[PDB]
Nucleic acid binder design. Structure first.
Ligand SMILES: [Mg+2]
Ligand SMILES: [Mg+2]
Ligand SMILES: [Mg+2]
Ligand SMILES: [Mg+2]
Ligand SMILES: [Mg+2]
Ligand SMILES: [Mg+2]
Ligand SMILES: [Mg+2]
Ligand SMILES: [Mg+2]
Ligand SMILES: [Mg+2]
Ligand SMILES: [Mg+2]
Ligand SMILES: [Mg+2]
Ligand SMILES: [Mg+2]
Ligand SMILES: [Mg+2]
Ligand SMILES: [Mg+2]
Ligand SMILES: [Mg+2]
Ligand SMILES: [Mg+2]
Ligand SMILES: [Mg+2]
Ligand SMILES: [Mg+2]
Ligand SMILES: [Mg+2]
Ligand SMILES: [Mg+2]
Ligand SMILES: [Mg+2]
Ligand SMILES: [Mg+2]
Ligand SMILES: [Mg+2]
Lengths: 129, 82, 123, 205, 155, 80
RNA sequence: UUAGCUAGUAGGUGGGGUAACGGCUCACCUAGGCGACGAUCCCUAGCUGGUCUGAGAGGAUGACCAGCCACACUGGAACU
RNA sequence: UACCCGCAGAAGAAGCACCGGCUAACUCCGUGCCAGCAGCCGCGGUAAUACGGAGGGUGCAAGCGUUAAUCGGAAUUACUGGGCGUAAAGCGCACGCAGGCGGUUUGUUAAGUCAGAUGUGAAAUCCCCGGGCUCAACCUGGGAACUGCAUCUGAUACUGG
């Protein structure tokens, strides 16, 4: 079943990028929007849009640099089957710092760098590079 | 009772004493309460040789702790040069 | 493979099986020669290999190799045994220590004398 | 605990002069330096990667007269110390008293210098030191003690030292028969034909 | 300038009417020492002809690797057939600590500081293919800056 | 300064006593998954006010029997 | 290739008991208590700081030193 | 006793394994599927660098080999870090209790999670910078570390109620 909506969003991005698709649409959620924000603010996607009221649909405009997709790798870390939580000092850095780790902290969803600056820890949602 | 004495460490023919606060019944190099100094009788007399935390030693005597004849003499020696 | 499957049934570490069980984690074992004979080896080899049936101090009855050219060994000889199979002799999983107990060293050896219990020749 | 056999054999195997002789003579006049020892010396060794690594380590060991146990402990220490392991290894060897006695010119060879140390003819800061492996620190004064100053060996060795390049990291007074280990030698002060990375390689596999 | 090293030589066999025909294979790597690597694979009835054919093929088929002052940008994974490869940027004065097939690629590419490991099959041809491809897909802080439209403050 | 524990009443069919289960999520020391872990405690309930299913607050005290060293503080929630 | 275990058993009341709380014990009352988050049964074993190995995570281990426990020919028992 | 001085003379002090590939080190003679070697592949029927001796060589050295033993290499129990069409591996198929996991919104809670503070985590050991034995081993000062546990006060994004 649809037990992991977050891994689905990442897979929709991953497959869309591989299929040279201009955009990817999926059923929306606050958490999907919070991740979409971090992806846009770090230049992994162009822009995101939430259409509808009763059945919200999140659309993400994919980014393509030159002959290639911007998102090289996008993997789910913490998942329903095994939750990954890290302390401020244990926070992981993707590509030795050249990539981002989406962390869910007490003060919201942000990058590994952001949480490190804010002295926070949390659930490691995904790795993006 | 609680006593302030020396635990023989160092090596064969080169002893190094550790001033310890302990229950007199425990073994010399065994179970102790507090490390309160050290004594090197093979010290080259140039830089250190005998160091004692006299503030903690007096705290323990003030609580009923006895002191060995060697440790008592080392307190006399440290109260004669410094 | 599942995290849930490993929580229920953890990763099972294989127990190592010894090729020298009669030694019972001892560098050597002492025993008495039950039979002192020769055996022919496996494909592609051919010879009359010197072997002995030895009853050890721990009760184990094993077959042991008698290395080197020539030996004084017979039934009731008290010998020392060490690990080491003989590849073309199936069942032969031990070696007799030459130059220990009732086992003599190899006669007139000059090279690798330590391995055959031969003392330094006077010269 | 010391190599006592023929010395030029070691130079012949390594294919370079290891300074195992005083230097009075040209190495070629004393041995067939370009040929390996024994019956199969003219044989060209198509040496393996392991073989080239081993031969570099043996060469360096044979120069300083260090056996495997002490040398492998020199590596362990070179690695533990901060900085370049390869460089640290050469500095530890170069800091040895027997080596310092040779480098100052008190001994014709490192073996002669080692005998001077063992035979209680060498002092470090006015105190007698007879350990060949003694680690000499910067600003230390190594001197031929008064009773050994008369020795013809020492006078003859300082003469041969004049014919060798002068070590930048040492200050020797030939008349007094005393020298000062100013500082540790830099990598640029030591031989370029020593490929210490092969030794660092050999001990890491 | 061009640094070239032979990795492996093997004796292969083809069967005909009148028995086996033995040929030789040579696997080689060439590099500038400043981020350019190419591998070559030659086949010939004699060893020198094969090592030669390999070097020719290695000189062309060269690629560019985005080095970071003698080391890698980030830890990288390489894969080819049965060979899985892992490479990590190490500190200054550590050297190349890797197996023969990976060490030759890293030497001639000019990677002076590496911690490497080959997993699975250690077949030299697929190990060097996995290493080269790993170094190839390795991206620079400038490349990730260009992609993201942010620059170059990845701190 | 009042150390306290919270759990639901598993048994109430005991004169002036109750069995309370304290449930917690624990990270697996090897496989990292968060596993459910229960602690059953024999608790003193004078007057027998706690009923089966009720969420209760308990505190550690001196031994009251061979299996009881805990006593009731308050009934947090009652009757599902 | 052990699935059920439990009568001082689990809890209550009162008397006794201990230096001390307590089924520690006794009388009476209630019918509980434990267990698939592994009880019961069977096999093995002193525990730790640490030790060895390993890049780590692990693996293996518990001589010497130090801490805790247990034992003193075997089984039982108290006396001071 | 340490240590220092004097005496006499190179005098009293070198062995062990290996040399076919892996693996640094090659020849002759003897033997002839024998005698024998062998960690693994494998050597031995007339040119055997593989047996045995010799000469030469390589590696270690007051030790050197052999056997035993733990971990490593072994991503070969794979948490980090594996797999199941044909190589070992999808139960013959379904239903389904326990269990695991669970769409989306708001409020609430604060168990998991995250943050800070405090206590504790013996000393020795390990590590770092020093000091002392002629050096070293060894001894030793101070620090770092003990990645843990607990309590209290907060945070509320995610998980749970
Ligand atoms: Mg020695
Ligand atoms: Mg394989
Ligand atoms: Mg009572
Ligand atoms: Mg026992
Ligand atoms: Mg003893
Ligand atoms: Mg003990
Ligand atoms: Mg007792
Ligand atoms: Mg008794
Ligand atoms: Mg060779
Ligand atoms: Mg042999
Ligand atoms: Mg012949
Ligand atoms: Mg072994
Ligand atoms: Mg493993
Ligand atoms: Mg597999
Ligand atoms: Mg088919
Ligand atoms: Mg099959
Ligand atoms: Mg099927
Ligand atoms: Mg609120
Ligand atoms: Mg400690
Ligand atoms: Mg010192
Ligand atoms: Mg210390
Ligand atoms: Mg300290
Ligand atoms: Mg919720």
């Amino acid at each position: 079943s649809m037990q992991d909506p977050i891994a689905d969003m990442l897979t929709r991005i991953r497959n869309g990028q591989a299929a040279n698709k201009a955009a990817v649409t999926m059923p929306s959620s606050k958490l999907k929007v919070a991740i979409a924000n971090v992806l846009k603010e770090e230049g992994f996607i162009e822009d995101f849009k939430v259409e509808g009221d009763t059945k919200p649909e999140l659309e993400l405009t994919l980014k393509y640099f030159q002959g290639k997709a911007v998102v090289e790798s996008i993997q789910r870390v913490s998942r329903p089957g095994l939750r990954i939580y890290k302390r401020k000092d244990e926070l992981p850095k993707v590509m030795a710092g050249l990539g981002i780790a989406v962390v869910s902290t007490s003060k919201g969803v942000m990058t590994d760098r952001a949480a490190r600056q804010a002295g926070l820890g949390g659930e490691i949602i995904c790795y993006v590079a | 009772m609680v006593t302030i004495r020396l635990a023989r460490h160092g090596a064969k023919k080169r002893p190094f004493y550790q001033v310890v606060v302990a229950d007199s019944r425990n073994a010399r190099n065994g179970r102790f309460i507090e490390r309160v100094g050290f004594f090197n009788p093979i010290a080259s007399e140039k830089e250190e040789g005998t160091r004692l935390d006299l503030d903690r030693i007096a705290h323990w005597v003030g609580q009923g702790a006895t002191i060995s004849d060697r440790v008592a003499a080392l307190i006399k020696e440290v109260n004669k040069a410094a | 493979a599942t995290v849930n499957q490993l929580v229920r049934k953890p990763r099972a570490r294989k127990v190592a099986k010894s090729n020298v069980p009669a030694l019972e984690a001892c560098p050597q074992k002492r025993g008495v020669c039950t039979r002192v004979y020769t055996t022919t080896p496996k494909k592609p080899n051919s010879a009359l290999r010197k072997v002995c049936r030895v009853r050890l101090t721990n009760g184990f009855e094993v077959t042991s190799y008698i290395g080197g050219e020539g030996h004084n060994l017979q039934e009731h000889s008290v010998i020392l045994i060490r690990g080491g199979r003989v590849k073309d002799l199936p069942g032969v999983r031990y070696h007799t220590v030459r130059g220990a107990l009732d086992c003599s060293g190899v006669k007139d050896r000059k090279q690798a004398r330590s391995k055959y219990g031969v003392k330094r020749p006077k010269a | 605990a010391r190599y006592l056999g023929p010395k030029l054999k070691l130079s012949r195997r390594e294919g370079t002069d290891l300074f195992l002789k005083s230097g009075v003579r040209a190495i070629d006049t004393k041995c067939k330096i370009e040929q390996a020892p024994g019956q199969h010396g003219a044989r060209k060794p198509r040496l393996s990667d392991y073989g080239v690594q081993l031969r570099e380590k043996q060469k360096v060991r044979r120069i300083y007269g260090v056996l495997e146990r002490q040398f492998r402990n020199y590596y362990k220490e070179a690695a533990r110390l901060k900085g370049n392991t390869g460089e640290n290894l050469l500095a530890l060897l170069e800091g040895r008293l027997d080596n310092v006695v040779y480098r100052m010119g008190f001994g014709a060879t490192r073996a002669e210098a080692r005998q001077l140390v063992s035979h209680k003819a060498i002092m470090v800061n006015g105190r007698v030191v007879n350990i060949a492996s003694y680690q000499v620190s910067p600003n230390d004064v190594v001197s031929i003690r008064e009773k050994a100053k008369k020795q013809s060996r020492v006078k003859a060795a300082l003469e041969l030292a004049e014919q060798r390049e002068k070590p930048t990291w040492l200050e020797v007074d030939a008349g007094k028969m005393e020298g000062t280990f100013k500082r540790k030698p830099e990598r640029s002060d030591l031989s370029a034909d020593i490929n210490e990375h092969l030794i660092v390689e050999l001990y890491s596999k | 300038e061009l640094q070239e090293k032979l990795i492996a030589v093997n004796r292969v066999s083809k069967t005909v009417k009148g028995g086996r025909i033995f040929s030789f294979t040579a696997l080689t790597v060439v590099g500038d020492g400043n981020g350019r690597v190419g591998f070559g694979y030659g086949k010939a009835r004699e060893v020198p002809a094969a090592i030669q054919k390999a070097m020719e093929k290695a000189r062309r088929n060269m690629i560019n690797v985005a080095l970071n002052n003698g080391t890698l940008q980030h830890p990288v994974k390489g894969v080819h057939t049965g060979s899985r490869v892992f490479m990590q940027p190490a500190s200054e004065g550590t050297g190349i600590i890797a197996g023969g097939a990976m060490r030759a690629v890293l030497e001639v590419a000019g990677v002076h500081n590496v911690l490497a490991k080959a997993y699975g099959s250690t077949n030299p041809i697929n190990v060097v293919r996995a290493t080269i491809d790993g170094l190839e897909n390795m991206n620079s802080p400038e490349m990730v800056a260009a992609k993201r439209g942010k620059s170059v403050e990845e701190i | 300064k009042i150390r306290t524990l919270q759990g639901r009443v598993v048994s109430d069919k005991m004169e002036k006593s109750i069995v309370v289960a304290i449930e917690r999520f624990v990270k697996h020391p090897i496989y990292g998954k968060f596993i459910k872990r229960t602690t059953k405690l024999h608790v003193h309930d004078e007057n027998n006010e706690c009923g089966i299913g009720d969420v209760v607050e308990i505190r550690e005290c001196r031994p009251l029997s061979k299996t009881k060293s805990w006593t009731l503080v308050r009934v947090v929630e009652k009757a599902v």
